[PDB]
Amino acid sequence: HLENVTEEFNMWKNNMVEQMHTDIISLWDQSLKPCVKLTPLCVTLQCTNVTNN
Amino acid sequence: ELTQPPSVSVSPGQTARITCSGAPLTSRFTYWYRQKPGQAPVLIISRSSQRSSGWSGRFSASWSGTTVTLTIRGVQADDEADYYCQSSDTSDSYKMFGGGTKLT
Ligand SMILES: *[C@@H]1O[C@H](CO)[C@@H](O[C@@H]2O[C@H](CO)[C@@H](O[C@@H]3O[C@H](CO[C@H]4O[C@H](CO)[C@@H](O)[C@H](O[C@H]5O[C@H](CO[C@H]6O[C@H](CO)[C@@H](O)[C@H](O)[C@@H]6O)[C@@H](O)[C@H](O)[C@@H]5O)[C@@H]4O)[C@@H](O)[C@H](O[C@H]4O[C@H](CO)[C@@H](O)[C@H](O)[C@@H]4O)[C@@H]3O)[C@H](O)[C@H]2NC(C)=O)[C@H](O)[C@H]1NC(C)=O
Ligand SMILES: *[C@@H]1O[C@H](CO)[C@@H](O)[C@H](O)[C@H]1NC(C)=O
C-alpha cells in the first residue's frame, strides 16, 4: 500500500490494454496454425431443408 | 376453404383412402375424427412429437403437396362413421372446418 501518493492514472490512454489486445490476437493465430485446414470444403453444396414433417 | 369429401365407400377387409385438400396445409397438420351418430368424436390420430404420429397399427398418414392422405388398416370392418377434417390457418389463428366423408 502506497501512502501520501496521488499518481494520475489513465484508462482510455493506457497501453496495457493495447498490449493485451495485440497479445490475444497473436495468441489465437498461434494456436490455430497447426490444425486441419478446410480448403477442399469449398465445393458446390447441394442442400435441402431439414425434416420438419 | 378446405375441401373434405363427404361420400365415399369401400369393401370391408380392404384398405381405404381419406383425403382433405386445402392451401393452408403447412402450419396446420390434420384432424379427422369419426363421430358415430349422436356420440362424441375421438382421436383419429394424435401428435406426440414434432416428427410423426402414425405409430399405432390401426392407422397411418401420408403427406402430399396439398391433399393429405389418411391411410387406414387392412380390415375396414366394424368401425364405420363419417370422418371429418380440421386444420388451422397460417397465422396460427382460426381453425378451418370443411366436412368429411361418411363411409359404408
Ligand atoms: C416492450 O414492452 C412493452 C410493454 O408495454 C410491450 O408492449 C406490450 O407488452 C406486453 C408485455 O407482456 C405484451 O405481451 C402480452 O400481450 C397480450 C396480447 O397479445 C396478443 O397479441 C399479440 C400481438 O400483439 C400476440 O403475439 C399474442 O399472442 C399470444 O396469444 C396467442 C394466441 O394463440 C392461441 O389461439 C390461437 C388461435 O387464434 C391458437 O392457434 C393457439 O394455439 C393459441 O391457442 C399465442 O399463440 C401466443 O403464444 C401468445 O400467448 C396475443 O394474441 C396481453 O394479453 C398480455 O397481457 C394481458 O394479460 C395479462 C395476463 O392477465 C395481464 O397481466 C396484462 O395486464 C394484460 O391484461 C401482454 O400484454 C404486448 O403484446 C405488448 N404489445 C402492446 C400491445 O403494446 C412491447 O411489445 C415490448 N416490445 C418488445 C419488442 O418486446
Ligand atoms: C427451404 O427454406 C428456404 C429458406 O429461404 C426457402 O426459400 C425454401 O422455399 C424452403 N423449402 C421448403 C420446401 O421448405
Side-chain angles (χ1 to χ4, degrees), chain A, chain B residues 2-3 5-13 15-27 29-61 63-66 68-72 74-75 77-101 103-104:
Chain A
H1 193 288
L2 289 177
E3 205 149 358
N4 297 341
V5 67
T6 47
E7 274 293 279
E8 283 182 291
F9 292 90
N10 213 289
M11 158 198 187
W12 301 269
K13 307 160 193 174
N14 219 28
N15 207 276
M16 294 182 63
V17 65
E18 276 299 307
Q19 295 193 43
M20 181 62 168
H21 191 1
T22 50
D23 269 44
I24 304 301
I25 295 177
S26 299
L27 177 53
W28 184 277
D29 296 335
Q30 198 65 29
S31 300
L32 294 200
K33 185 180 182 181
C35 207
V36 170
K37 297 198 85 290
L38 253 47
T39 39
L41 197 34
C42 299
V43 294
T44 45
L45 305 162
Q46 283 189 27
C47 335
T48 38
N49 308 3
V50 84
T51 51
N52 303 102
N53 203 340
Chain B
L2 71 84
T3 297
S7 52
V8 194
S9 41
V10 81
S11 64
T15 168
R17 190 184 83 189
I18 324 293
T19 63
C20 200
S21 177
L25 256 298
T26 45
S27 163
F29 200 63
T30 53
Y31 299 166
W32 286 288
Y33 311 152
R34 38 167 179 81
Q35 183 198 33
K36 286 197 173 183
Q39 311 204 35
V42 293
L43 73 178
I44 184 60
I45 219 64
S46 60
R47 197 181 165 195
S48 64
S49 186
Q50 85 280 1
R51 165 189 161 264
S52 177
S53 285
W55 285 93
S56 177
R58 333 268 298 276
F59 321 113
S60 184
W63 183 276
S64 299
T66 293
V68 305
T69 305
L70 176 55
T71 72
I72 58 114
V75 157
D78 160 74
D79 300 329
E80 278 311 322
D82 33 354
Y83 288 84
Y84 274 104
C85 157
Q86 298 103 352
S87 289
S88 176
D89 201 318
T90 52
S91 177
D92 210 330
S93 59
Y94 176 77
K95 327 228 147 202
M96 290 227 163
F97 277 46
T101 171
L103 200 96
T104 55

